Amino acid sequence: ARPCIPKSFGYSSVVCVCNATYCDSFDPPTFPALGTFSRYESTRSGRRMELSMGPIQANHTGTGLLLTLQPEQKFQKVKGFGGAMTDAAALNILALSPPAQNLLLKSYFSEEGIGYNIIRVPMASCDFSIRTYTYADTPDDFQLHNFSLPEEDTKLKIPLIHRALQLAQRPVSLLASPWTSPTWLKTNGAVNGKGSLKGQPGDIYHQTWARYFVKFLDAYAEHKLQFWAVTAENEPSAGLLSGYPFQCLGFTPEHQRDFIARDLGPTLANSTHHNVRLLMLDDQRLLLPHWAKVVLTDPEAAKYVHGIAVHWYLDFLAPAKATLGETHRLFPNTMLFASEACVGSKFWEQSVRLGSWDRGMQYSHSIITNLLYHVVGWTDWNLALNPEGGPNWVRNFVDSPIIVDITKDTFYKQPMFYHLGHFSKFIPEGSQRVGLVASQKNDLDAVALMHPDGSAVVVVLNRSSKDVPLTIKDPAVGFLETISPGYSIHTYLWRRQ
Template identity: 65%
Template sequence: MVCVCNATYCDTLDPVVLPAPGTFVKYESSKAGKRLERSEGSFQRSLRAPDLVLTVDTTQRYQKIKGFGGSVTDSAAINILSLPEKAQDHLLRSYFSEEGLEYNLVRIPMASCDFSLHAYTYDDVPYDYELTHFSLRDEDTKLKIPILHRASAMAKRPLSLYASPWTSPAWMKTSESFIGKGTLKGQAGDKYHKTWANYFVRFLDEYAKHNLTFWAVTAENEPSAGLINNYPFQCLGFTAEQQRDFIARDLGPALANSSHRHVQLIILDDNRLHLPHWAKVVLEDEQAARYVHGIGIHWYLDFIGPIQDTVVPTHELFPDYFILATEACIGAHFWERDVILGCWERGNQYSHSILTNLNHFVAGWTDWNLALDLEGGPNWVKNYVDSPVIVDSSEGVFYKQPMFYHMGHFSKFIPEGSQRVGLVASKESKKTDLEYSAFVRPDGAVVVVVLNRSLQNVTFGLADTGRPHRGRGSGQLHPDLPVAAAVTGLRCPWLARGWTEAVGLQPHTAHALRPGRCGRGGAVLCPVAEASTRVRWDPERCARAGGSGTPKAGILQAAECWCCCSNIKC
């Protein structure tokens, strides 16, 4: 099933509104046809717990989230601009606006890649070591840059742009060619390496003239590709040692001494099976490591590079460097069909990959082309693949595929600055086909994403007590997750921060409150109780805060400092 959009119609999503205290909002997509369908409900205290209960533990904190997005290649821009102007707007809004998925990451190839109409760089004049002939191409000024400006204008969240080069000019390479096996001529510190480093700076300079600044650059797209004989499209080979030396002696200093010193540098940008070796070679060198901020990974060989053997040890060795999934698409392998319109399983593959990465310290996930045509191109070497959005320019329409909606379960609800938190399955059902992850947003709301790829419906409970081993006082929802479905849930901010209640008091008259305003409905400041596993009742302080009365029997099981004020309506 696909959703069809044209110049006059396109499905939209409402901006996210946080639920009231004690309630949740659920967004569900399913093979049966639901597409981020919204529903609301209340956490209940009297339901019999199902066999599987997922308990949010906000005291367990993991990596911060950078975000989610896709890539503006030449081909993506060509396809978007092939539509009528209003349909173009619908497509871009679908990705970037509050009415859509709210992408915040955008990857841009530095010059051409395979998803271009031809191979080119920004300075193909031989031996121009001063880069006097460096200039952006029509693909930048007429395609990618206008798209980026329009996307930025539609987005409420700031966009983080990052750029990746596929190849240097051929005259800098040992192969004298854009394709095939080849590295930079010479060695780190020489004129070829200095010129290539300055090429990055010139790229950033030229885009800045168009009022576009970058969050990051990667040192090279898939540096291992340029070490393969007869590689079919643009590439530039580096070993880990060569990348280390290039960064330490050339690229790092060039960026640091430019007006773009704030731009972050990402190493690897290749399949994760190169980890942890690649990171150890580069980051154990002090001269290189001081210029590096993160590590980029691709998904194409995940089946021979388990995440526990690659990403996890890398994070353990280098916890101060973020890990970002920088490219993924389906259809790249010879055994995969290029475009399959409406394929739900491909959406499942996206969600499975994203959840696996997020649950193992990865800070975000970037899709490949934002849009392709019905063939999966254009691609100058016919390396066709699938995309979340497929454009049929002859009909003036585009199709939103299941992959698009699966991306939305993450990008729309887990903004930059969110943090992964604990989500523990009940002991009764440690073995489950569900995949899941939980996050606290910057606004304090908790987001839980659950994926069911099994062949049967799964009923589960979701509890949030702040202390997963103490269920008393928790609220639960008991959704039924259909076969082949993904669901994202939001909880209100202060309840999501480990809320607990005095046993015997009703939720609407007594709460364990975090210091601050009482939910949305009032402006009562609750005083801070003593830091203890038991929260002391202080009637004088509560009276000053606007509460009255005395508590009934029970213990507040608090993870932090709380107080209980009765008769405060939230």
């Protein structure tokens, strides 16, 4: 119903400008007639998920690129897509006027926007916090009598999550992850640096830390929120590195294995939260398959573990086939889920590049590669940051698909927002990846899925300068004659019956 109001900040593409009275949005989602396809197109040149339509034709001739759907060749079911409601994200959202807040939440969570169905919720403070805290900072509280949620949860995160749910048409799944334990549970007695839980799995320190997960889930439940899943620790490898600058808790894979087997698994299993899924790793995929082997070859750990969460920061040297591919082959019934990504974290990168097409293409390239290697979901980091890429108590500034500009009561929707939307809007929970065979080698990135209802979705990313004409064959419905412009991303949808 409303188009992108474009603005250039001198980077390769534009942001879309939203404020208290205006934000780009969609009409109610509908499938066209049997025999018709919808194309959504975004381009570096400025198109933002523009809707066009074409006929599905009876026949096709030529030697051009042909992508044939393999509807009967079935892979993983999708869980979903979304982002992280950090302290930083919550502060940036609530710094907007209430009507601008509502257009930002509708951008992410409504069918008028891109239909996020995953929110990652830090358990207490991380780097994207302005205050260092846990839920149990009173020392030697082993029974966790003094556990409680501060205002960061009760006044900021929890209301924003309810407002997100209220706007959503599809069930939203909450994912919880801790960065640090209380410092009195740790070898080094600090939120950051090299340090693990004191003692060993099975002891008072580890039982207290597992009970903290149940206390967290009890407190959010008091505020009428339920979790889909928790992770065993955010980036457990971080706490093994001397001087790690922010909140962390170190586990070797053996320590994670034994923590899960002895404390976290049983403690959750014997709680009212027994249905909350447990994900292991929550770390760089180069740790696979070794970490999957250590944890899941212990049957007493494996029986508690639903899935393996991965972060994208070292993908450059962790080939998909050797990490995701090999983990799937060894442990096919243990889902893989991407739980954290962002651009701008390198010291030689600027934190925020308003309108960066490169950063959009990093997102869609990552999502396609994950989907081609069995991953069930992909989660962004901060839902929103300021133009500095903050706030962040260690000035570890990064980029976000939405940048809030409080002085103008304005927010900017970057290419990353639309590139993630090409997936999140059009691939509902329960969608299954299906095969998509290329007639010839090509520079395109493409993935096909089937909606639970049986309808088809295909995403085609062109990271080249060259226009590529192509045809998509649905061996049962007919042929889509199309073209993939240079520096474009398309989502195609069509009913099959």
